[PDB]
Amino acid sequence: QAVVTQEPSLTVSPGGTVTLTCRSSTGAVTTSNYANWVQQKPGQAPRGLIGGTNKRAPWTPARFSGSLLGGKAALTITGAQAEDEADYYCALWYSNLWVFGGGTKLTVLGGGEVQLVQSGAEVKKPGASVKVSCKASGYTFTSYGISWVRQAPGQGLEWMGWISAYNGNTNYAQKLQGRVTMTTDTSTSTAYMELRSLRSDDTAVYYCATIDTASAFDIWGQGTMVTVSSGGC
Amino acid sequence: SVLTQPPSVSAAPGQKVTISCSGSSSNIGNNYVSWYQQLPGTAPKLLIYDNNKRPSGIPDRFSGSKSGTSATLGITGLQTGDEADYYCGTWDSSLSAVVFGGGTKLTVLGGGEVQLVESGGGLVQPGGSLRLSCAASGFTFNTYAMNWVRQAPGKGLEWVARIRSKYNNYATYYADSVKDRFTISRDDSKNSLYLQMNSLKTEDTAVYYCVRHGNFGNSYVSWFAYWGQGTLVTVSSGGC
Q: Which of B239, B155, B230 has its CA nearest to residue A87?
């Protein structure tokens, strides 16, 4: 099976030039790989940007250009804007199949480019504790504030509290004070939420999210379902 | 809830819809308001921050305003993909906490923009099964091949399956990872694409996208032009 490889992350200042590359494990990337570039802005669905090495989508700005350079596919952004912050995926055609690279997380220096990955679903008995993890991949973890929001089935959003990944200070929702603990691990870029003395009404999807300069949550984790039931497993 | 919003509202495609949120001096009155859009089983998505600012990628048809102790979300030129639950959120000074409205579920009642609306995602046990749907609009569905592409949390894109149009004998293709477990199909009379997912494994956990091809100039057709919003499929034993 062919493997497509990309830089995991890059940073560019507004107005700068950045070159993203896409390597094939089979040899030099050729026009016969019809290199495609797909853009995924923070919290958005992806959208095609470049196809057939250098063909622009109708919505692709002139500042983006696709090419081949030294055996790799290349995506060049000339005069980067804050709007260009995204995860960029390249895809190469190998006879009867598109193989995607792992993506390049491009941060535009200003709220950097990250993906949040939460731990799996949990089944708990009343009285037990649950510890949910939230790992950030991309721009420097300590630049972030992490907030926890939960949602019971068919109900509204509920703020649980938040923490700074820079200094570790917390603020918890009044209802949960003394039952909830939020922590971070700098070495692993992971935020943690522990909720103790679980009861039936704790059954919800638990989300972690980054915090804005404005206290708005731009990037969210996929959520973690916690089911609290008498029977348990 | 601290913030008050109507439980539901309906509107037609191409029309304008407004969603209002009522608070007090301690919250909306003196703090910046945010708006979130939420599709079923998936995470909220930031639409508006600082009362009226859009993050990049949020269409210009979404707008926000604040007047005294009330805030309003405006959606002009409604699209089928705008059918979602909308939440207002702000900081409450008297509580020293983030507060949310109860959410307004917007129902949106060929035409419009290219839209790929997904449903059917959810949480299932290993060995379970799910059926995903993609309702297409804004183009002649029966002339297009469609693809399913998935993205596991914090990971890259992986092609799943392809179905050609009627003009190419509805030819189907599958990634080796899903061969014999998944079935791609379509119902042209319903403008719908399906993904039947049987014998689910924990490694099938991902956001699943339906994708439609598009012209990239007059000499190339990218399979990856238009994408749906995605539907989350979680396959877990729940630590059992």
A: B155
Of all residues in chain B, what percent are helix, strand and coil, respectively (each to 5)? Answer: 10, 50, 40
Residues A121 and A231 in one domain: yes
Which stretches does DSSP call E strand in A60-176?
64-69, 72-78, 86-93, 98-100, 104-108, 114-118, 122-124, 130-138, 145-151, 158-164, 170-172
User: Residue B123: CB partners within 8 Å, gap ≥ 6?
Assistant: A121, A225, B41, B234, B236
> What does the radius of gyration of chain B's CA atoms come to, in whole angstroms?
20
Q: How far is CA A44 from CA A201, A219, B43, B186, B233, in A?
A: 31, 9, 11, 26, 17
> Which amino acid is it at B229?
Q
A144, A210 in Cβ contact below 8 A?
yes
Tokens of A58: 């109708």
What was the experiment behind these coordinates?
Answer: X-ray
User: For residues B87 and A40, what is the distance between their CA atoms, to the nearest angstrom?
Assistant: 23
Q: Which candidate from A38, A45, A149 shows the least CB-CB separation from B230?
A: A45
Q: Strand, helix or coil at B29?
A: helix
- Interface check for A231 against chain B (CB to CB < 8 A): the answer is no
Nearest Cα to Cα of residue A104 among A77, A151, A58, A138: A138
Claim to verify: residue A162 and residue A204 sit in the same structural domain: yes
Out of A89, A137, A220, name the one closest to residue B44 (CB): A220
Whether A121 and A220 share a structural domain? yes
